[PDB]
């Protein structure tokens, strides 16, 4: 659409110095590295001669990285990858919540300790959404060689079915989805030569949102009224608990 949008959101992905790799796994070597900007320009000669422009439909950028992984990779000059902070309680806003007695508070404490064990994993996952490497983490076991680590990380990313962030030099694209990962092992080199095509998952906001990206502490707070479909509760079986004894009388 606008020509102004071009430079504006062309710089919207700035590559940090730390050089995230395929998502934090930089322990290989990039033999080749390509991106494919494509466009659909409708073919036939456009209709008016005055204003019938705005006909270059954009396309999902793909990024192809072929490299090699060896047992012993020595990285030349790159800064450490540091664990991102847990900035979830930045807006956390208590102290308006009710005054409730002890062991009414502590009952809530036990409930919180009870379902934090079941939610905190996915909470960390969403905190570390772009970058899977420090989610899966350094393998940490001395038995698995480096090619172990590359293969098991790649399989974890691939089965994860979550988009990752991929850095070609000068850009750290934010939501790349692993499209194709082909590791090859010649019988004349113990390394693994792998080609990985990613495809950006670009998605814009249709609806009025005053806040671009809030904290977890207000993300639901500023959410607009979400919609779920209908359903016939009278015709459910998986939870057809009887009427509570406290209600039949009342």
């Amino acid at each position: 659409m606008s020509l102004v949008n071009g430079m504006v959101e062309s710089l919207n992905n700035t590559k940090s110095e730390t050089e995230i790799g395929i998502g934090g796994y930089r322990l290989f070597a990039r033999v080749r590295e390509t991106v494919n900007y494509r466009n659909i320009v409708p073919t036939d000669t456009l209709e008016d001669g005055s204003s019938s422009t705005d006909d270059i439909i954009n396309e999902p950028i793909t990024v192809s990285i072929e490299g090699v992984v060896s047992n012993l990779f020595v990285e030349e000059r790159q800064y450490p990858q540091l664990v991102s902070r847990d900035f979830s309680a930045v807006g956390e806003i208590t102290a308006l919540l009710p005054a409730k007695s002890q062991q009414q508070i502590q009952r809530i404490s036990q409930i919180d300790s009870q379902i934090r064990d079941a939610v905190l994993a996915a909470e960390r996952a969403e905190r570390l959404a772009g970058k899977p490497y420090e989610f899966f983490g350094n393998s940490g076991n001395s038995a698995k060689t480096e090619q172990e680590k590359f293969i098991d990380f790649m399989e974890a990313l691939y089965f994860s079915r979550r988009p990752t962030e991929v850095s070609v030099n000068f850009r750290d694209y934010k939501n790349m989805a692993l499209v194709s990962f082909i590791p090859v092992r010649d019988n004349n080199t113990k390394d693994t030569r792998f080609t990985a095509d990613f495809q950006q998952i670009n998605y814009s906001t249709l609806v009025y949102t005053p806040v671009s990206s809030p904290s977890k502490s207000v993300s639901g707070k500023v959410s607009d009224a979400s919609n779920k479909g209908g359903q016939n509760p009278e015709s459910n079986e998986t939870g057809e608990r009887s009427l509570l004894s406290s209600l039949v009388g009342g």
Binding site: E19, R26, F28, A29, R30, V31, E33, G67, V68, V69, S70, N71, L72, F73, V74, E75, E76, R77, Q78, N169, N187, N188, T189, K190, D191
Partner: protein, 142 residues
């Protein structure tokens, strides 16, 4: 250092049969055929070092006398109905700084690859046979 050999060409043993008849000249030539560690260069600058699986495969080239029993042995191996596997060693006795010492080069899982080029010359005969065996793994130690 000060290295004094004995028995100029190293003693070669294959299949419990030690070559007592080597041609003059390049009697034994143990050429490693493939590079040891292959390396790759990254965009950012790092290098990926990786040992070749072919890192050990060597070709021992043997110059035996044109009809001496060593030639008979190697020729019988060449003419076998199925490829014969050689598993031997090149042992060389030598002295370093006056101390007697032995250098051992074990050759493992070889077969005759390039057959000898048989020439019978009049003006200047070349009564040699060069059998090239390709051992899977050759390890030198001393």
């Amino acid at each position: 250092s000060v290295i004094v050999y004995r028995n100029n060409q190293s003693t070669l043993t294959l299949n419990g049969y030690t070559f007592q008849h080597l041609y003059q000249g390049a009697a034994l030539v143990l050429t490693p055929v493939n590079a040891k560690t292959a390396r790759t260069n990254s965009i950012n600058g790092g290098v990926s070092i990786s040992g070749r699986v072919d890192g050990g495969v060597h070709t021992l080239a043997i110059m035996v006398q044109k009809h001496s029993p060593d030639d008979k042995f190697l020729n019988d191996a060449k003419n076998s109905q199925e490829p014969v596997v050689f598993d031997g060693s090149m042992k060389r006795a030598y002295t370093e700084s006056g101390t007697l010492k032995k250098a051992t080069t074990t050759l493992e899982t070889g077969s005759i690859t390039t057959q000898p080029t048989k020439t019978d010359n009049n003006q200047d005969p070349d009564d040699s046979r060069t059998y090239v065996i390709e051992f899977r793994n050759s390890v030198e130690t001393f």
